[PDB]
């Protein structure tokens, strides 16, 4: 089976550089073009570069022409996307694909930024038929929190919202079950949040 | 070259007929291509050369073309088909894609639950004083929160997070934030949330008393 990865995105400094890698397998990208196209949010989807790994010949969008470099080594069949001067424009997941584009990878997520790492507070949401309890998860940079409850065992009615970014500067999400009421003074109900980017993982008992 | 796609979003039931257009701002001859995007997942190649269905992809879906106009249709809309759709030229050096198409799955009204949540012990030390509004299990998406402060009604001080259509209810949730300094929460009694939704015949509040347990 065909298949593309893409690997080190990360969280950099504006003015700053990082490259990126595009692995090919199942296919060898002699015989294609490789194209890096990118989702900046609320952007849509746009093609930034392309390359023909044959003879190295590449394209640019306008927006990246000069301070990016598109290249390929044939031999370890990846392609690559050294970005440089790089712009807070420029923050996106970048996927990439072949040649119709019939295969892409599952995208880098790339977050430029002066901001330092930070770790989230985790509030709980206490209870106060049915009733809903949560957690808050507040106050951390750059995206993403993952979080699940009873360490992966209830995920049944688990509902957790979009990150919203305050006008700190910082995210902050929640996440709500409903449980039965029946089960509130005996059921313990526990909010496991991870945030990579700082290696903080928070484990919140959520109680009545 | 440019790629205008109507419309932006849409909800429909299982089995209907849905149509999905681009137009190009010039000639793209057939060099039009229409992708499926699910969120966290990678772009999949649908249509190809404006026609032509790639390999593994269901018959119910199909593309055509006449002159600058391309449309993406799905003849019958089973509930895997839920994502948003992208259409692109490669006619030209860039390639362009259209703004895509959100298409959601249509279903009978629910009114929300509502829940109301004071701010934590915890966060309250650190001087802080966030306060929580939940809606569960609704439908369709529009709702509206109003926050309530000793009945004063407040204004840019709040946010809210909608989640995507739940797998397998196809209903919303929705939270809302209130936050405030600690100095700000305690000069007030009553916090209030009231919701509006077509689900409720009436606007529901939920509401409770700053420091009752």
């Known amino acids: 089976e065909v298949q593309l990865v893409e690997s080190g995105g990360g969280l950099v400094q504006p003015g700053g550089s990082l490259r990126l890698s595009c692995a090919a397998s199942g296919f060898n990208i002699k015989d294609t073009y490789i194209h890096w196209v990118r989702e900046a949010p609320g952007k849509g989807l746009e093609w930034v570069a392309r390359?023909?790994?044959?003879?190295?010949?590449?394209r640019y969008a306008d927006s990246v022409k000069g301070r990016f470099t598109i290249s390929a080594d044939t031999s370890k069949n990846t392609a690559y996307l050294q970005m440089n001067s790089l712009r807070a424009e420029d923050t996106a997941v970048y996927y990439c694909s072949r040649w119709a584009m019939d295969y892409w990878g599952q995208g880098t997520l790339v977050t430029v930024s002066s901001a330092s790492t930070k770790g989230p507070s985790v509030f709980p949401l206490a209870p106060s038929g049915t009733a809903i309890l949560g957690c808050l998860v507040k106050d951390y940079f750059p995206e993403p929190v993952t979080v699940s409850w009873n360490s992966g065992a209830l995920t049944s009615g688990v509902h957790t919202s979009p990150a919203v970014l305050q006008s700190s500067g910082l995210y902050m999400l929640a996440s709500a079950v409903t449980v039965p009421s029946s089960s509130l003074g005996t059921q313990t109900y526990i909010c496991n949040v991870n945030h990579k980017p700082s290696n903080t993982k928070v484990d919140k008992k959520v109680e009545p | 070259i440019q790629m205008t796609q109507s419309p932006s979003s849409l909800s429909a039931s299982v089995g209907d007929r849905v149509t999905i257009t681009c137009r190009a701002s010039?000639?793209?001859?057939?060099?039009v291509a229409w992708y499926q995007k699910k969120p966290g997942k990678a772009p999949k190649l649908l249509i190809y050369s404006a026609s032509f269905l790639e390999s593994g992809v269901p018959s119910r879906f199909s593309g055509s073309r006449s002159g600058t106009d391309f449309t993406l249709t799905i003849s019958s809309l089973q509930p895997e088909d839920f994502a948003t759709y992208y259409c692109?030229?490669?006619?030209?050096?860039?390639?362009?894609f259209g703004q895509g198409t959100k298409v959601e799955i249509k279903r009978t009204v629910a009114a929300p639950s509502v829940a109301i949540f004071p701010p934590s012990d915890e966060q309250l030390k650190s001087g802080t004083a966030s306060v929580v509004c939940v809606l569960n299990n609704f439908y369709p998406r529009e709702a509206k929160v109003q926050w309530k402060v000793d009945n004063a009604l407040q204004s840019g001080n709040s946010q809210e997070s909608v989640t995507e259509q739940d797998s397998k209810d196809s209903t919303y949730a929705l939270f809302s934030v209130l936050t405030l300094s600690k100095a700000d929460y305690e000069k007030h009694k009553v916090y209030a949330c009231e919701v509006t939704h077509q689900g409720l015949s009436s606007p529901v509040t939920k509401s409770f008393n700053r420091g009752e347990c």
């Open positions: 010039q000639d793209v001859n057939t060099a």
């Open positions: 692109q030229q490669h006619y030209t050096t860039p390639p362009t």
């Open positions: 390359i023909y790994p044959t003879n190295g010949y590449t």
